[PDB]
From Swiss-Prot:
Changing residue 139 to E: Severely affects Bud32 binding and does not stimulate Bud32 kinase activity. Component of the KEOPS complex that consists of Kae1, Bud32, Cgi121 and Pcc1; the whole complex dimerizes. Pfam families: CGI-121. This is Regulatory protein Cgi121. Signal peptide: none annotated. Belongs to the CGI121/TPRKB family. InterPro entries: CGI121/TPRKB (IPR013926), CGI121/TPRKB_sf (IPR036504). It comes from Methanocaldococcus jannaschii (strain ATCC 43067 / DSM 2661 / JAL-1 / JCM 10045 / NBRC 100440). Component of the KEOPS complex that is probably involved in the transfer of the threonylcarbamoyl moiety of threonylcarbamoyl-AMP (TC-AMP) to the N6 group of A37, a step in the formation of a threonylcarbamoyl group on adenosine at position 37 (t(6)A37) in tRNAs that read codons beginning with adenine. Cgi121 stimulates Bud32 kinase activity via an activation of Bud32 autophosphorylation.
Length: 150
């Protein structure tokens, strides 16, 4: 399966500003309110590595995969970055530290571990018929077209 390849971290109180993008480093930030777990995000990265559909860039592709294969604009509206409870996607711990400086919040990995509140809203934006574990269910729906739950 996976061993958390990239660095996905959960931060709460992280005020998203335009300066985070001006460092031109390798990062993506999506909504931690709609996330199942790290397994959801790292999977979407892994989809961008194997299949290139129609997206602008690699990190801009990741955000579209996690929503059931979308486009940059749509996926930003649905599961894009917003201030407060937000999901950090990075390659290097130094780059994660860089972005952390500009956003400024508290690290709480529990926003990336799934609960009943995430469960009911997750079925709204992703629209999945499935009970049990939401982590497995979101991957099944988004990766069904992607030709592999990997």
């Amino acid at each position: 399966g996976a061993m958390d390849p990239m660095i996905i971290r959960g931060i709460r109180g992280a005020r998203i500003n335009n300066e985070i993008f001006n460092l031109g480093l390798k990062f993506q930030i999506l909504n931690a309110d709609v996330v199942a777990t790290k397994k959801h995000v790292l999977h979407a990265i892994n989809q961008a590595k194997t299949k290139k559909p129609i997206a602008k860039s690699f990190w801009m592709e990741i955000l579209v995969r996690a929503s059931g294969q979308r486009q940059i604009h749509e996926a930003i509206k649905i599961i894009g970055a917003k201030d407060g409870n937000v999901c950090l996607i990075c390659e290097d711990e130094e780059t994660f530290r860089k972005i952390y400086e500009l956003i400024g919040g508290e690290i709480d990995d529990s926003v990336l571990e799934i609960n009943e509140d995430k469960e009911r809203l997750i079925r709204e934006i992703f629209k999945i018929r499935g009970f049990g574990n939401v982590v497995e269910r979101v991957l099944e729906k988004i990766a069904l077209i992607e030709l592999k739950k990997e």
